[PDB]
Coordinates of C-alpha atoms and ligand atoms in Angstrom, one line a residue:
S227 CA -0.2 -26.1 -0.2
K228 CA 2.2 -23.3 -1.2
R229 CA 1.4 -20.3 1.0
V230 CA 0.7 -17.1 -0.8
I231 CA 0.4 -13.4 0.3
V232 CA -1.0 -10.8 -2.1
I233 CA 0.0 -7.1 -1.8
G234 CA -2.3 -4.8 -3.8
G235 CA -6.0 -5.1 -3.9
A236 CA -6.3 -5.6 -7.6
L237 CA -4.1 -8.7 -7.4
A238 CA -6.3 -10.2 -4.7
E239 CA -9.3 -9.5 -6.8
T240 CA -7.7 -11.2 -9.8
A241 CA -6.6 -14.2 -7.6
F242 CA -10.1 -14.8 -6.3
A243 CA -11.9 -14.2 -9.7
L244 CA -9.7 -16.8 -11.1
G245 CA -10.4 -19.5 -8.5
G246 CA -6.7 -19.3 -7.6
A247 CA -7.4 -18.7 -3.9
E248 CA -7.9 -22.2 -2.5
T249 CA -6.4 -24.8 -4.9
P250 CA -4.3 -27.9 -4.3
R251 CA -1.1 -26.1 -5.3
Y252 CA -1.6 -22.6 -3.9
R253 CA -3.4 -21.3 -0.8
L254 CA -3.9 -17.6 -0.2
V255 CA -3.0 -17.0 3.5
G256 CA -2.8 -13.2 3.8
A257 CA -3.1 -9.8 2.2
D258 CA -2.5 -6.1 2.8
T259 CA -5.3 -3.8 3.9
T260 CA -6.1 -2.6 0.3
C261 CA -7.4 -6.1 -0.3
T262 CA -11.2 -5.5 0.4
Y263 CA -12.8 -7.3 -2.6
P264 CA -14.4 -9.7 -2.9
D265 CA -15.6 -10.7 0.6
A266 CA -13.1 -13.6 0.8
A267 CA -10.3 -11.0 0.7
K268 CA -11.8 -9.2 3.6
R269 CA -11.5 -12.3 5.6
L270 CA -7.8 -12.9 5.0
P271 CA -5.6 -11.8 7.8
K272 CA -3.7 -8.6 7.0
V273 CA 0.1 -7.9 7.0
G274 CA -0.2 -4.1 7.0
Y275 CA -0.6 -1.6 4.3
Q276 CA 0.7 -1.8 0.7
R277 CA 2.9 1.3 0.9
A278 CA 4.1 1.0 4.6
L279 CA 4.9 -2.6 4.9
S280 CA 7.0 -4.2 7.7
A281 CA 9.0 -7.3 6.8
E282 CA 7.9 -8.9 10.1
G283 CA 4.2 -8.3 9.2
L284 CA 4.6 -10.2 6.0
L285 CA 7.0 -12.9 7.3
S286 CA 4.7 -13.6 10.4
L287 CA 2.3 -15.3 8.0
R288 CA 5.1 -17.6 6.7
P289 CA 4.7 -17.0 3.0
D290 CA 6.3 -19.1 0.2
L291 CA 5.2 -16.7 -2.4
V292 CA 4.3 -13.0 -2.6
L293 CA 2.4 -11.4 -5.4
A294 CA 3.1 -7.6 -5.2
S295 CA 2.2 -4.4 -6.8
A296 CA 5.2 -2.4 -8.1
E297 CA 4.0 0.4 -5.7
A298 CA 4.3 -1.9 -2.6
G299 CA 7.0 -0.7 -0.3
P300 CA 9.0 0.6 1.3
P301 CA 11.8 -1.0 -0.7
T302 CA 13.7 -2.2 2.3
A303 CA 10.7 -4.3 3.4
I304 CA 10.3 -5.9 0.0
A305 CA 14.1 -6.7 -0.1
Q306 CA 14.0 -8.2 3.4
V307 CA 11.2 -10.5 2.3
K308 CA 13.3 -11.7 -0.8
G309 CA 16.3 -12.0 1.4
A310 CA 14.2 -14.4 3.6
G311 CA 14.1 -16.9 0.6
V312 CA 10.5 -15.9 -0.3
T313 CA 9.7 -15.6 -4.0
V314 CA 8.3 -12.2 -4.8
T315 CA 6.6 -11.7 -8.2
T316 CA 6.0 -8.0 -9.0
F317 CA 3.4 -6.4 -11.3
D318 CA 3.8 -3.0 -13.0
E319 CA 1.5 -0.1 -12.2
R320 CA 1.5 1.7 -15.4
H321 CA -2.1 2.7 -15.0
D322 CA -3.3 1.5 -18.5
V323 CA -5.1 -1.5 -19.9
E324 CA -1.8 -3.4 -20.6
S325 CA -1.2 -3.2 -16.9
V326 CA -4.4 -4.9 -16.0
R327 CA -3.9 -7.5 -18.8
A328 CA -0.5 -8.4 -17.3
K329 CA -2.1 -8.7 -13.9
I330 CA -4.7 -11.2 -15.2
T331 CA -2.2 -13.2 -17.2
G332 CA 0.7 -13.0 -14.6
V333 CA -1.4 -14.0 -11.6
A334 CA -2.9 -16.9 -13.6
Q335 CA 0.6 -18.1 -14.4
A336 CA 2.0 -17.6 -10.8
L337 CA -1.0 -19.5 -9.5
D338 CA -1.2 -22.1 -12.2
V339 CA -4.7 -21.5 -13.4
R340 CA -3.7 -20.3 -17.0
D341 CA -7.0 -21.4 -18.5
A342 CA -9.2 -19.4 -16.2
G343 CA -6.9 -16.5 -17.0
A344 CA -7.4 -16.7 -20.7
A345 CA -11.3 -16.8 -20.2
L346 CA -11.1 -13.7 -17.8
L347 CA -8.8 -11.9 -20.2
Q348 CA -11.2 -12.5 -23.1
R349 CA -14.2 -11.3 -21.0
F350 CA -12.2 -8.3 -19.7
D351 CA -11.2 -7.3 -23.2
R352 CA -14.9 -7.2 -24.3
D353 CA -16.1 -5.3 -21.3
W354 CA -13.3 -2.8 -21.9
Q355 CA -14.4 -2.3 -25.6
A356 CA -17.9 -1.7 -24.3
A357 CA -16.6 0.8 -21.7
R358 CA -14.6 2.8 -24.3
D359 CA -17.5 2.9 -26.7
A360 CA -19.8 4.3 -24.0
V361 CA -17.4 7.1 -23.0
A362 CA -16.6 8.0 -26.6
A363 CA -20.3 8.5 -27.3
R364 CA -20.7 11.4 -24.8
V365 CA -18.3 13.9 -23.1
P366 CA -19.5 14.1 -19.4
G367 CA -21.4 17.4 -18.9
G368 CA -22.3 17.7 -22.6
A369 CA -19.7 20.4 -23.5
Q370 CA -15.9 20.5 -23.2
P371 CA -14.0 18.0 -21.0
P372 CA -14.6 19.1 -17.4
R373 CA -11.7 19.8 -15.1
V374 CA -11.5 17.2 -12.3
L375 CA -9.5 17.3 -9.2
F376 CA -8.7 14.2 -7.3
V377 CA -8.3 14.5 -3.6
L378 CA -6.3 11.7 -1.9
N379 CA -6.8 11.6 1.8
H380 CA -7.7 8.0 2.9
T381 CA -7.3 8.4 6.6
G382 CA -8.0 12.2 6.9
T383 CA -4.5 13.1 8.2
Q384 CA -3.4 15.1 5.1
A385 CA -5.2 16.0 1.9
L386 CA -3.1 15.4 -1.2
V387 CA -3.9 16.1 -4.8
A388 CA -3.2 14.0 -7.9
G389 CA -0.9 15.1 -10.7
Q390 CA 0.2 13.0 -13.7
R391 CA 1.5 9.4 -13.7
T392 CA -1.1 8.4 -11.2
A393 CA -4.1 6.0 -11.3
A394 CA -6.3 9.0 -10.6
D395 CA -5.0 10.9 -13.6
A396 CA -5.5 7.9 -15.9
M397 CA -9.0 7.3 -14.6
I398 CA -10.0 10.9 -15.1
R399 CA -8.8 10.8 -18.7
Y400 CA -10.4 7.3 -19.4
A401 CA -13.7 8.7 -18.2
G402 CA -13.5 11.6 -20.8
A403 CA -12.4 14.4 -18.5
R404 CA -9.2 16.3 -17.8
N405 CA -7.1 16.4 -14.8
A406 CA -7.5 19.9 -13.2
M407 CA -4.0 19.4 -11.7
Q408 CA -1.3 19.8 -14.3
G409 CA 2.5 20.2 -14.3
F410 CA 3.8 17.7 -11.8
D411 CA 3.8 14.0 -11.3
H412 CA 2.4 12.0 -8.4
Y413 CA 1.0 13.8 -5.3
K414 CA 1.5 17.0 -3.5
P415 CA -0.4 18.6 -0.5
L416 CA -3.7 20.3 -1.0
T417 CA -3.3 24.0 -0.4
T418 CA -5.5 27.1 -1.1
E419 CA -3.3 28.0 -4.0
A420 CA -3.3 24.6 -5.5
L421 CA -7.1 24.7 -5.6
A422 CA -7.1 28.2 -7.2
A423 CA -4.5 27.2 -9.8
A424 CA -6.4 24.1 -10.7
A425 CA -9.9 25.7 -10.8
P426 CA -11.8 22.3 -10.9
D427 CA -15.3 21.9 -12.1
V428 CA -15.6 18.7 -10.0
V429 CA -13.9 17.3 -6.9
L430 CA -13.3 13.6 -7.0
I431 CA -12.5 11.7 -3.8
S432 CA -12.8 8.1 -2.4
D433 CA -15.8 7.1 -0.3
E434 CA -13.4 6.5 2.5
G435 CA -11.5 9.8 2.3
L436 CA -14.8 11.6 2.2
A437 CA -16.1 9.7 5.3
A438 CA -12.8 10.2 7.2
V439 CA -13.2 14.0 7.2
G440 CA -16.9 13.8 8.0
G441 CA -18.6 14.1 4.6
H442 CA -19.4 16.5 1.8
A443 CA -19.8 19.7 3.9
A444 CA -16.4 19.2 5.8
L445 CA -14.7 18.7 2.5
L446 CA -16.1 21.8 0.8
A447 CA -15.4 24.1 3.9
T448 CA -11.8 23.3 3.4
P449 CA -10.2 26.7 2.7
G450 CA -9.8 27.5 -1.0
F451 CA -12.7 25.5 -2.4
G452 CA -15.0 28.6 -2.3
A453 CA -12.9 30.1 -5.1
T454 CA -13.4 27.2 -7.5
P455 CA -16.3 26.3 -9.7
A456 CA -16.6 22.9 -8.0
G457 CA -16.9 24.6 -4.6
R458 CA -19.5 27.2 -5.8
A459 CA -21.6 24.4 -7.3
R460 CA -20.9 22.0 -4.5
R461 CA -19.9 19.2 -7.1
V462 CA -18.4 16.2 -5.3
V463 CA -18.2 12.7 -6.7
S464 CA -17.0 9.7 -4.7
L465 CA -16.2 6.1 -5.5
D466 CA -14.7 3.3 -3.5
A467 CA -10.9 3.7 -3.4
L468 CA -9.9 0.2 -4.6
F469 CA -12.6 0.3 -7.3
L470 CA -11.5 3.7 -8.6
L471 CA -7.7 3.4 -8.4
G472 CA -6.8 -0.3 -8.2
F473 CA -6.3 -1.1 -11.9
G474 CA -8.0 -4.5 -11.6
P475 CA -10.4 -6.7 -13.5
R476 CA -13.3 -4.2 -12.7
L477 CA -11.5 -1.4 -14.7
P478 CA -14.2 -1.2 -17.3
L479 CA -17.1 -0.8 -14.9
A480 CA -15.0 1.7 -12.9
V481 CA -14.4 3.8 -16.0
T482 CA -18.1 3.7 -17.0
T483 CA -19.3 4.4 -13.4
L484 CA -16.9 7.4 -13.1
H485 CA -18.1 8.7 -16.5
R486 CA -21.8 8.4 -15.4
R487 CA -21.2 10.0 -12.1
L488 CA -19.3 13.0 -13.5
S489 CA -22.2 13.6 -16.0
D490 CA -24.8 13.4 -13.1
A491 CA -22.8 15.9 -11.0
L492 CA -22.5 18.3 -13.9
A493 CA -26.2 18.3 -14.9
Ligands
HEM791 C1 0.0 8.7 4.6 C2 -1.0 7.8 4.3 C3 -1.3 7.4 2.9 C4 -0.8 7.8 1.7 C5 0.2 8.9 1.5 C6 -1.4 7.1 0.6 C7 -1.1 7.2 -0.8 C8 -1.6 6.5 -1.8 C9 -1.3 6.7 -3.2 C10 -0.3 7.6 -3.7 C11 -2.1 5.8 -3.9 C12 -2.2 5.6 -5.4 C13 -3.2 6.7 -5.9 C14 -3.0 6.9 -7.4 O1 -2.1 6.3 -8.2 O2 -3.7 7.8 -8.0 C15 -2.9 5.1 -2.9 C16 -3.8 4.2 -3.3 C17 -4.6 3.5 -2.3 N1 -4.4 3.5 -1.0 FE1 -3.3 4.7 0.1 N2 -2.1 6.1 1.1 C18 -2.2 6.2 2.5 C19 -2.9 5.5 3.4 C20 -3.8 4.5 3.1 C21 -4.5 3.6 4.0 C22 -4.4 3.6 5.5 C23 -5.3 2.8 3.2 C24 -6.2 1.7 3.6 C25 -6.3 1.3 4.8 C26 -5.1 3.2 1.9 C27 -5.8 2.5 0.8 C28 -5.4 2.8 -0.5 C29 -6.2 2.1 -1.6 C30 -7.3 1.1 -1.4 C31 -5.6 2.5 -2.7 C32 -5.9 2.1 -4.1 C33 -5.7 0.6 -4.4 C34 -4.3 0.2 -4.1 O3 -3.3 1.1 -4.1 O4 -4.0 -1.0 -3.9 N3 -4.1 4.1 1.8 N4 -2.5 5.5 -1.7

């Protein structure tokens, strides 16, 4: 009965896994375009994109409650939605396990399925221990931690690269590798010099980013890749964007999948 909109794919994932989607107290009525999992989230109508929201886009679905990533914005749109008397409950994006725990627990609370939350949390904590043990047992590539560059270019308009304090940086480290980009936070444009300075062994990119530019050959013919080990060896790994970067209940499997795929590419 209370109308809910979720902003941030991980939060929608959590909401659905928890059976919080269609209950007598809370109905999920919309989401942003990062909400692609599970299939029920695909079906929700969309308000826009997490980081380029319009207040009207959100408000046209008449929400009573918004569950929102701390990275949702711009800030004026979030503030306009609160100013419209809508409750907005915000979740941190600290890119660690505590962040996912707070999503599981916080979404359970906001949606009033606390018990399903405790069961998912417990199951998550055990999967996570299994993921960490599997990574600790083998450095991907068999030698030193490989240098991994993350390319962010979801729509193909502008290739960006990941520095520190990003989901990508955290995922790279969790998977037993090192971020080839060092010395700045967040994202900056991909340039020939940024590639040469980073000298990656592997290029990581989302499935969607890779397909937006036309595939592996288009990516590697980008000027500057030829001077990098990853470019000479044509080493490109891709995962679904939400799965890789979302910091949701599938974090353990994402970390293990990224670990496995880095190893395959390096052997
Ligand atoms: C100028 C355009 C865009 C910029 C600059 C951009 C920027 C970003 C950044 C900074 C992140 C977080 C990455 C990290 O922490 O490592 C991200 C995550 C993501 N973005 Fe975008 N983005 C753009 C467009 C899009 C569009 C159009 C979509 C989908 C239609 C998309 C889907 C995603 C997804 C699924 C994630 C990860 C999960 C999430 O954030 O909820 N982005 N984006």
